[PDB]
Design a protein around this ligand. Sequence first.
Ligand SMILES: [Zn+2]
Ligand SMILES: [Zn+2]
Lengths: 156, 156
Amino acid sequence: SEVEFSHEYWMRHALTLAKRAWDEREVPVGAVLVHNNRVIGEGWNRPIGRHDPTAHAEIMALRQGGLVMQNYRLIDATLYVTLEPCVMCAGAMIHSRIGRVVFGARDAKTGAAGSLMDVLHHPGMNHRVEITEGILADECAALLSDFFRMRRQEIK
Amino acid sequence: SEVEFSHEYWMRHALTLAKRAWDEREVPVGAVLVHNNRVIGEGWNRPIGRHDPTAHAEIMALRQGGLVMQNYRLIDATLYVTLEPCVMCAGAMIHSRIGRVVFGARDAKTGAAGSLMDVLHHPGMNHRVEITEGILADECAALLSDFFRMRRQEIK
Ligand SMILES: [Zn+2]
Ligand SMILES: [Zn+2]
């Protein structure tokens, strides 16, 4: 079913992080940054609790990676995130120079890797980040679905 | 002649922050976030020294503003930055819901406020950030130019 170090194996770890966001009552998105099959950064969405509009899963994983690698450039790393990245995160991926982003569910309204727009393969960027899409898309989208319901199950 | 609280008055303050980046040998870009004419965030470019690819002046200013306002949404705030923002920072401004970005020099190669692409007024966004461009542009451009000149020298 899920071989060690395959995309699904790392995405499942990202889903463990997306659940931390779930517990903190934030949109459940998780991300893990991997280099040579070692975790060098982990993150979950938490803009509300951090009072920070930039606190997305991807930004958190990328900033930790920079610290772990002692380099703002994260050459050859692969960033796994449970939801297609937004424009901000796609831009951050370009500046980080990572090798690839692997995402789960598509974000139909604001995804920047094909959905709302494509930032990553736009011709004028100075670095091409490869894209793998739809890994465990169903579980990723169900987590989000369970959240937007259990959430309206709050608006009394 | 620069009236207190005018765009030029705030951009001149962002230029002082830009010189801090210069002093740290970082591309010289500075930013100041203002709400009701009071500083709620300040930033300068420091990705290299912070080992953080997301450490642009704008991101630093927005994060500080969020702390001060106790809210990731920075409604009606105005962000001054000495150089047209990149895709990542433009994306961040949209998530923060600021009212306006005022910038200095255009970034022809990779500006996301019209140069390389326009993220801010893309029609699929859920928030429109107003744009004021070119405030003290010549000064902002000279600082950047003097930098890439001084740097190209330093290469022994
Ligand atoms: Zn994002
Ligand atoms: Zn930027």
